[model samples]
Target: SWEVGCGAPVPLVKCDENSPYRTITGDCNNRRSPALGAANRALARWLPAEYEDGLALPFGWTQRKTRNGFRVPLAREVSNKIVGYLDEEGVLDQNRSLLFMQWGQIVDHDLDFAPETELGSNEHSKTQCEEYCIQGDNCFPIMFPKNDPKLKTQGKCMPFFRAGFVCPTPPYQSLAREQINAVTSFLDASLVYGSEPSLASRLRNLSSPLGLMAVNQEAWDHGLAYLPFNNKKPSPCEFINTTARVPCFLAGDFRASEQILLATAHTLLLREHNRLARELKKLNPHWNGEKLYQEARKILGAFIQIITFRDYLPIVLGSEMQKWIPPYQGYNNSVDPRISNVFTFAFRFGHMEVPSTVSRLDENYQPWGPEAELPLHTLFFNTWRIIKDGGIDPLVRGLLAKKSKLMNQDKMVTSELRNKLFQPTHKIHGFDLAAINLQRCRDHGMPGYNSWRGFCGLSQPKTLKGLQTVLKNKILAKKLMDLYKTPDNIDIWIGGNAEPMVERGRVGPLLACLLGRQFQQIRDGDRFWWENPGVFTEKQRDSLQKVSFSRLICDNTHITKVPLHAFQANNYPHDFVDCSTVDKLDLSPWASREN
Candidate 1:
């Protein structure tokens, strides 16, 4: 378990045991090992019937029906490009570099709508690219080469750099005018619907949304261009894929960049939504929907404040939270497994105290730190202190305690109402909930800090009452005081102090906060277009909708250019594949092995 050397300082970093950073690459990991085999069974609980045996998946999602079977260009090759660019910090270099990494493929195949041009053929794409990789010292400047014009026209049949090599894109993100014109022609040839009378007459026909498949497919092809398969195992790609040659992106510090781009993309998404909000208003002159705008704002607002409560608790409590608690007696001068151990021994026991990183409350007493920082017991107790010695906003030694107390309590109350009061009726929402809960648990564990029974308060509290009844009960008042009492057995309600106000019908701020959660992803293109103005709106929206949907239904078969797969009526694809082939050399990465 000891990863770093013995001499390393104690409490080297204020990290949570459950933190993504800590759990994956921590000095002293206190979390339980993951269970992978059970993941599919758990997945099947909510997956479609076809997904029961892992046969057919949602349209965007792919399944492995053939055990160790090769498809074509291979899954590994496609993933390599994405993962490769991710490793190289290419996306960060240019905000659109992610899109650009695949830009090479798009250009090589002359995929429509993208501005970049193919610099060379598929073979040139590889040899020149590999030569450049050989020339590089640091991880920078490694990429797919662009010299083979033959592969450019023919598709597939290109060479790759090597194992663990990353992909690169052109210096300038934009294409040459000549290439742009040619791409425009290609877009026309591909016949992806935009704002032409033949497709749909629009006021301003800015960009062609019909051609995104070409973009994704072209990227898929380029990913195939770099396959390093010696014909082993099933090809990973749908076109020609396998785990051995699973494509990875080439970039530097992708973890950080992904967070950065995710943030940017979220921002860009909001801009598009805001733009659409304006357009929908324009399109429907007589309509007035403040609810739509309000909902949008609520979601966006939650995005602005980023906090992690779930990750910190296990760390804050130290190793006591793990499934198998490390023996307290054996804890040495090395990293303390328990939160208390960390606080006590690491900081020289009582010799030192945690630093005052926060500011104090106003004239009255209140704590002004993250609401998450206050233990449920401390929050309830300290909240009483503020209420008892009330001032403008009761201050903690540091935080403006009253606001923290009130807000957190309000949040808890709302959570309970949403869970207990609202019957979980919408079965369709269950899948979303499953996915959400899964993702949430991965990051934060079961809602209320992994407290399966009830979240000490976050999940669903042990008891509940009508807002008026609790207000009148003398025994309840006493219990509220004891609510913050130091005891292990007594778990609390969903919303502590925050419950009363929500029961009283003031539920704007916290709901707004939920929607504002930037890390939370939107479900679809509609959500995407509606939230981010600059990304797509008006004509672009129409074009994207027309083309994308055109692929789905049989009615619009004449309109859609790229191939479309099956999707259930309401749900979006849970996954995707790289359907395009780069050159014709061999779409089968495992042809010899399969043969």
Candidate 2:
């Protein structure tokens, strides 16, 4: 059946005996079920499916009334009234910098990328699902509500291809349909070296005897290299200006050029991989390219785990939620490392923190590049700007100086993101992120907000007063109650997002609960868990823990001064410190013999 997610069951694989390194395809991570979190497998739902039919259909599948006897509002209606930002000014969350959001993006690209189901292929166009009002197997278009000034006249609805389904596991092929996760679920930095062998081969510098990841020969700063021009056909990004032009840069993740900030991070990790490999090569001259590549990947991946849990998580989940993450005893195969679909929903809350622009500051941390700051829209899939704007340093410096948008119930989203996501270059007229977010909830078949509240053991408000009480803001709660007749009928995204932040956290209480549990599983379930005894020695684990996100920026880019903790806010030169003082990832721990 070519009905998207309705594919034949995937064949089995025998777990290999042992290897110090993880596999390119995430096989054998769990010997019990090799395909548990492997590429193209179903995303596990920590809770039960809330599919409208208890099978494949999503929530809000029709004009049908909801539990409160009111029809589910159109996605656009929700976005316009509830979440969209209309003001020109945005408040800065001065406690943090853009790097806080950047690393979050990096971590997200590693965890999941649910490729939408393909429509008609080779013989025909993929637009089989694009036609407005078309009701096909994978075609679930988001219809526009009344008086959508611009969009109503332009089209009937927005096209949304449902995520393809993986072959059902033996447990029961008759269960509700699950969406696909196209990459490994581990914190392994698959985004740098490529997720699959085919892409990995393309990204490696096999021609170099030194065993390194490929870098651009044309662009280098501070004796550092940029991502090589992507030569793959059916181009990922279109770089067409005559003055300065190059194709999309290649990396482990296909969405590398989606945001120049993300590209900067990709280039940073790419450099770190090469740096580790070259040093490993110096220490172990006897090692082959395979051994060097694998070893470098292992160490890089470990640093990722540390940066994510140690440095990154606290800022996001809040201090109290961070404490709730049970200490990792050891790798427990009983725990599934697979990312939960519900967790993915909560993680999107980071979108609220993305600013309109990242300041590109110079060495002294002043406005640097020709374009001191690139607007969020201008940078999307724009590698040309990265090269022409004086490489990664200024951009890196910019993020260091720029403050991120404060995560609040209102004015959290910038007009740049809300209005022009992938527009100028890719989109015909651009997409609305707020609308797409709620639409995605319906598409994924997530239950009402109250369902998650009860699951998290939080109070489920039955009345408007109860909702307003939990919301804490009298006006905001009143607004939400009017929009959603009942608390039980509220969408998960708004509910999760609208709730006030947990103590010392970026997200609210419900999000903290879901994200915390999901991350705990991601760490504890990973067999190659960095802190696990078999993965690294005590000294090595200690060294790895010492590695900071600031250090990675120091090692990879031309920037010499940075905040001790790059994720937190710094007032330019005032708070910035010398790079030499920044903690380094002492690679001596992995050295077989010292220089």
Candidate 3:
């Protein structure tokens, strides 16, 4: 497995010639490269990395006095002026529901998760990043402007942990430091079944012959069970009521309980997994736990793909959907399905869509009361609200009924996310989501705005006047040049977010190309893609094609009425439809009289 002098090992993996099920680790998806889209793999690069040190240091890390007699502005300073600002009167997108934003989180969790590095040492010789403001190996802290608003009086630097380094894959030699994808790259819902074997097993109800995922039996509502709790000491979930303590819910992804709305999404899918498993058992009594689990896993992944391709992509990509995201032409072994480093940064555009508050509506699709709407900051890592404030029903209703924050260039991220995101409920201030993101951009050593524009086949603007042609915002174009001094020095994210939105899309031209191409690879390279022939019968594919986000909401929860398309913002009693009209996935196609 060793390759000459490279510290990274070229893993030697043997593939099963005829297993229908995808391995939990995602190995053998491609016979040529057994770990092609597997968990803990190095993310592929769309363009060659542009690290400042030529090996491992972040883009802005210092070794010289200036870049041709000019200094890169602080990440915080750039964020304060260029990317983010507070909007007193919240701007709402009249068409897209906040669920559109929520679904983005679900898709993102299913695809990629790069855990922060635990590389730095502290006063006690232990690995710690949050406590230390200094950039010690893995700690790339963001400093605040002295007279700045929220963080100035509290502290000088916002402690941050950079994504950890992974050894170069053995086939490639003379390695530069690379970041690892802690989860699989496939759009397969590792968010449901998990990316690793041990966690997958832990999530299952092993004692049940029927094959079901573990659920909280004690917490039942409307004939459904909640997600099981994490039993470990000191749960990560911070309670809404400061006095009443609670534990975080367990799911395939460790971050399921990071917010109340996300937990509801996880719960809805969990219920459907078990629900589908039971139906399969009835159809084939001979099928045991393993068969039921694998079959249901296969089908659930299909539903996810169908909904994303059919519903979500059009809204996010707009007219660019058909242009860059090519339809699947069947599985091609030659294509590498790995997620690119640049696209990962590109997907962070979802942050702009986050609402200032979480909407909690009642059965009539109206706010339950004055307290029904919750501030976005308080919802972080808080699962107690779901339990105390009735249940997940209200949250689900509100998701589709409410309008998402408009993606405006004048006002980027909401005040809640910009200044108050994940503020320790007990503390006075929290980290700036924008500054952390900008710091992360440099730490990842992403190529600048000019490089990305050219990568997407657009003109690489060299001057403010030229950039304005793309952004169309003369003020923003000039502000960018004022802070960055040159188009080449502008961070990749800032450039993408600043560009004018594509026709009927949430993002700009550069972002659309990056996102669309990455997704195209995700669909074409997988051997087990849902629509690929032999993966499903023609009849089953017919049923899957009928599936929608609205159908899933109707089937799993007490929610009876929902938006016809959950992503679109529709008002109550007028645009909403009853559960009777929502189409369901007919499982009869899979029914067989097994011997």
Candidate 4:
């Protein structure tokens, strides 16, 4: 039991006074060129934060003694129970497809922590570590219920899942148990640009320009890149027809190719960059590769921002929240869009949207046959299937045709994701995504749901019954009370996902607020925001705004027919438009007038 609010407030500002726009280039005085500065800012907000101090604890939830203290409030077991409940009760008819899940994840990778690299000195292998909660001393164990009547040793200790994370203190117990440091503390497009300087450099083929990344056309011909598999047996990415291993995304979040949709997205973006490079070359016949590459890279960054805030966000955050906190209000250097601990934890609700199976649909929107549907378990780490599986169109169509599991209070997750995440690929043959979400929040020392509500301007709940107003489920609220003695102690991810969703939206109030605020900060804090006057010419901006997701898919992939609005699965008023009929980004606006 910890008391709150006795210490001086932790300074929340992570940026230096001179670091205007939160640019990736840490040097405040030397921001370099406008295009470079813009690229830095774009990349900075996509990777995880790096600073140790200056973190802002949620309102009233700070540690009692330390000036900059935050802690994992609930014990490890509590998170497991919360996730277990969500997984068991919160499944619904799938309304979106695996593609939808993949896109959200791809976007998230661009804005989240780099994966844990080394599991320190815990003698266990990856499989051993994940299955039995045996890992590096710092990795917290995810508890499973042993109280069931069916178990032989009811109420005794049961199997535990070990989390993969970095423990800040060398001795493990020297600091507070909650001090789990993420790889990078910032959230820049580290997925597009590398997370660290060296990796970032590797991503760029600097021979052309400081901005342009290397592209292996031979690799793209094979598909997305995969790491070398020293041992025999097909790597997760290998399929029937392709033996060729390609280069991964420009940025080194190898998880980009973890699934079909994410891999396709990575491929599409890679193509978009090369496509723009070629277009810019054609437009400015005399411009060297360096000038053409930088301009094209800058334009690609702007398109990512435009499509994210305008198209993808509105769908994930829901119509009402989007309207209330609209993006594209022009750039204001004041709003800092550094990734928050809360956003990192709660935004993972997207994982709940993942389905159990990956479907292959024909151009006519019908399944190719029984072989067309693959259990998501089998698809994990398998990218070669994309090449042998008739390219990216079938998966794209499936995302459009297949329904995603609805994330509601009762059934926030589907069994595929909940019970069998990564499936046979996982050490235990299956693992709990909800469990990971809950554990991640506590692992990061994220403040409770009530604290976040207070931050979001809602009246914080003082009692379990009062919590019902936000959660909207008596049983869930009761269960939460049972797991966590007080409403103030409930985990944000568990509570946020269960909140009453606004009409026609996917996220509830808390998640909606967090996501909207983050995206808003992204737009406002970004100096290179697409709508910023100097970043684009009047013509460039107009043509950019006209660019849609449908056009991107049509222009890049083999897909033919698609809904004009790529986010929405259904084609009602806007029927499936022919690939040729879609509005494309005309590079003529980008053509250079100067000699």
Candidate 5:
């Protein structure tokens, strides 16, 4: 099992494939070939049950069978829910307006018209009001006659006409006038929508305080609906459809705070992949636009998949408890369920990515981060779509690479020969070195290999070893000459996210494994070849696998995989050593040694 001249093996936390919990813990760097297929099925599960008989996607996903699930035409379908469940006649009639009473919260066991009230009325106020409302409407006077004696007093006037029946109550004066102002402000309308006389009557009479309140509440309760009438609420309604299942990539309301944190890592990783691709592209400018685009897309996609899969833990776990945190603690679940669900999923699933102290803390300002919950925006959404459509890049191709890099950290590489790992189709035949180097520089703060070569009076190498040597010497020379040195994989650990970045000193080995896979694929001269690469020898199956989507953090159950030693070494630095770059040519220990 031992191989000569392989240098030091990178230490990793291993998982057992044969364990009872192998379903969850066994594979680390594995790609579930069936993952895409499974996801297709999974996403379709939410499809409207009515449309299971027929399905279509712009990207060519076909619905395989008719199954019982929620089908929606668009993200707008999310708003349909509140409408579908609450209203009858398939219409939002005038009678169905905002419910003012429902809009406010119950304070001190008494419903308060104004949440800003200084001194809350005790239980008597509630009992008297309910009794008055029950028996007093002139339209249905017997409803609350016991309490509402048709008070002629200024401050306490006659109660509404229809207390219990729908739309029977006349518009309350203040609530109606206030609602008019709110509509004006929300729509910035110069005049109401109806004609002069009609509009006036509508604003003053038809769109009464109670009526307008009902309408406002309806809009607030649903997503993707324009506010017909508005109040002085400072916040703008989120534009996202409550039913959307996709993650927005660029930035928008769909993302939770922890989702944003995961995005930061993905963005950083993709930029790195792009950097490498640009370098490889420079060596081969003959690559066509489609080729370059596909290559770039795939490179970014790999990083997206890897980082997304890796970071999904935090997003899922952290979502469960986000409601207790700041800026979101008071958000109402009834108003925007999508926001609430996303928040919960990210908190529960995202906990593994967060610290225990911060995760377990009660309502207090002690926990600083899990910094920003991002909204899933158009840009962020497109970023992933582009990747999913594009296949994986060949630069970092190798079976061992894929196994070691993307799978579990502990999974060992059994083969060293690139030929044995890759088919011709998965090989990256040639590359544009300059472009790849530029990307590396941009993404990692590493000096461009070519620039370093030029500065050091060296030249590009034809072999992997030669390239490594040249690049290594250039880095060393730059450091020796007191020039600004480019950073390594470890650079992010120094101080990013404006917090003392917690580097598990993990991910390094996995990344290397990924790169190794690319190297193997490149040597094989194919861009893609998992199961049966068409360009080379064909196989019956396609290459692609389901990655582990579930994750659980190691608790203090004495699970060996937990970083117990590192956990306990908090107060002081200890000699926890592992080899990360033994076979990685030019980068010597000085590159990683304490500066």
Candidate 6:
């Protein structure tokens, strides 16, 4: 079974209760046990009881039904025209966009996973798995639109396939006639920590400490994470050719090393962990490896929390939600930071920001050369290029130098992502991100657009005139009505991502609300939030806050310059600064005081 796990014990006090440990900022204490908390902080994602049946919605959201007996729109149809729009020339946008998109995905992996119900294996068999197709009911091929001209068959759709995943009403009882069960529902750092406890423990280098994970010193010395390569399934590496497979860095999520920017982010964090562990060893020479490792793990966990809340969320959620930053109250057991249906589906909006081509830029913020740019299609599942391209500096620099797609009305996606998201190794036509996103929402039974607007404190419009208020485009609103037959049938991702950007903000009202609420829950529910008083000494907390993304790049990569604020688009007064100028983490506060 993919989701077998033990229940986490409850705390003496409810997480929402007023307690001595609670912060003045109105945050509560964490209800989950310290061991479970530690595992979650590291990256284990266990399934929740409510999600066992799969189609059940999380606590806060509404399970959608057709309103006024209106027809439910096809998920495939909603995905096609709504999300399929893209700009081909928009390939060379800024790097900040790429960073945020990958960053969000990394975080997303931490929270949720859809179990592979078909083969029960990590490998993709494509549509050619005829043996599997005839062998089992679990294998479900992705069906293409009948109207597609290139397709030869009308019924089978595209040969591009994925496994059939459904949620059964009762375990070991039903054939799962209706429900869609996800692998895991909570947003624990499953990517950073293993989903299984045994695997999580195995990921660590037990020789050093219970807390410290194994790092390849040789690779780290070369400024890359230690990724061991042995020809194996579930390994993140790509099989480039016979006798040639480069292993990607192992993490809680297998997708950590999928692309250059994603791999670079994973490496940066891996180096940060090793860097902290070394410093902890130096400060507490008398401490056992376990003690040092645990202390270091604690710091690393806090650092991730800080980076996400302080750096990433503001950019994704925009300024409107900034005011909702929870006061630094401590952990709350009652606060279950489960992944929301809307958040899961709507967050895919960042796909619109992806550019078709990735370029390498020098410190001067100009292209390295015409040859420096790498088409994203070619880079798919390829790591040797990253290694041969003189390390991740060029990619990292390019990300900062490039401009992301506007994700606005005129052009929502790029041709690269719209058509060629993950072009197969055989050079066949690639999959569509928009289609997958729309289909995923339907697969998970996520509520339609109108339902989410109501949840996000916006008006649920029944008519095109009313929808135009939120969507801001009469043509798009009319299109929504014509396609879905009603505004209530529109998908959340299309509506939320397509809505006009808030003044000087990245997202609109619907997305802002969902993102804001999710971040708030993460902070309020987390037991070891970085600012919590008992979690860290005042000195340590200050040092952790001082750490920045730019400094992480400086410490890990060959790049010597980055914007003061890496999330913001580069400009005057916030231009690239020497890596040394970025604030570095001071580990003295974590020094062991043992006599």
Candidate with best lDDT: 3
Candidate 2 C-alpha lDDT tens digits along 249-339: 8888878887788988888899899999988888788778888888888999988888888888888888655465867788889988899
Q: Best candidate, TM-score-wise?
A: 3
- Measured against the true structure, the TM-scores of the candidates, in listed sequence, are 0.17, 0.93, 0.94, 0.76, 0.21, 0.80
- For all candidates, the clash counts are 108, 4, 0, 35, 102, 26
lDDT score for residue 383 of model 5: 23
Q: What is the lDDT of residue 46 in candidate 4?
A: 26
**CA lDDT scores, all candidates in order:** 0.21, 0.77, 0.79, 0.56, 0.20, 0.58
| Runs off by more than 4 Å, candidate 5 | 1-42, 46-260, 288-290, 303-348, 351-595
Residue-wise C-alpha lDDT for candidate 1, range 261-374, written one tens digit per residue = 121222222232344344444444443354334332322222221111122112212322232222223212222111110111111110001111213333222233344122
lDDT of 6 by residue, 206-318 (tens): 77553566665433334456443323453334544324455556665566665667766666666666677777777777787666555665666676677787788767666
Please give the lDDT score at residue 569 for candidate 4.
Answer: 57
> Candidate 2 — worst ten consecutive residues by lDDT sum?
123-132
Q: Which of 1 and 4 is ahead in lDDT?
A: 4
Whole-model alpha-carbon lDDT for candidate 4: 0.56
Candidate 5 lDDT by residue in tens digits, 1-595: 0111111211234544332111111122123221111100111111121111121111001224312221111111111111012111222112111111110100000100101111123434333433443321111111111232222221131111211111112342221100000011100011112112223233221332211101123322112111123221211111122243223332111121112223322222333333333443564445544344334333333322332223321221133212212221221212210111011111111111211110111112122234211112222212232122211111011100111111111111111110011111112111111111121112112222233233324353434344334334442333212211222211111101101111232222222222222222211221121221331122211111221111011110111121112211111113212222111111111111122
Q: What is the C-alpha local distance difference test score of candidate 5?
A: 0.20
lDDT of 6 at 242: 26
Error of 1 at 479 (Å): 28
Which ranges of candidate 1 are over 4 A from the true structure? 1-459, 463-537, 547-565, 569-595
TM-score order, best first, reads: 3, 2, 6, 4, 5, 1
What is the lDDT, from 0 to 100, of the residue 293 in candidate 6? 53
Better of 1 and 3 by TM-score: 3
lDDT accuracy of residue 397 in candidate 2: 82
**Ten contiguous residues with the weakest lDDT in model 1:** 38-47
